[PDB]
Design an enzyme around this catalytic site. Structure first.
Site, PDB file in Angstrom:
ATOM      1  CB  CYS A  39      14.808 -45.482 -49.076  1.00  0.00           C
ATOM      2  SG  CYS A  39      16.114 -45.896 -50.202  1.00  0.00           S
ATOM      3  CB  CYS A  42      14.959 -43.835 -52.417  1.00  0.00           C
ATOM      4  SG  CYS A  42      14.868 -45.615 -52.106  1.00  0.00           S
TER       5      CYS A  42
END
Length: 115
Positions: A39, A42
């Site tokens: 991700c 993130c």
């Protein structure tokens, strides 16, 4: 010249489904950052979440992280549809969700649930 900071924040890893049930089960509100190594966003919002854990809100609300890849049972029970997702719990129930790398929405929700 005035003081050095003494960090008191705690972002804790949730490493099992039992731990997940224990920490989300009580009157104390907790917030979990659902993330994964693949991700990208993130990596932008994670550090923000960590700094917020060091604020006085961290005395009232517990801060945790769940690696969605490593914790399939938790992720499936919670119903994660995007990453990152910040999910708030109280008394074993999901009470709020913030999707994505949205620092103002994340802070607003932390303030709301730490009153």
């Amino acid at each position: 010249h005035h003081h050095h900071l003494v960090p008191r924040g705690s972002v804790q890893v949730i490493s099992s489904y039992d731990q997940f049930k224990q920490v989300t089960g009580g009157d104390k509100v907790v917030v979990i950052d659902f993330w994964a190594t693949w991700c990208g966003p993130c990596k932008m919002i994670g550090p923000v979440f960590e700094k917020i854990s060091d604020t006085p809100a961290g005395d009232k609300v517990g801060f945790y992280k769940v690696d969605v890849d490593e914790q399939s049972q938790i992720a499936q029970e919670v119903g994660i549809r995007a990453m990152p997702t910040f999910v708030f719990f109280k008394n074993g129930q999901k009470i709020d969700t913030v999707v994505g790398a949205d620092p103002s929405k994340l802070q607003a929700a932390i303030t709301q649930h730490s009153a």
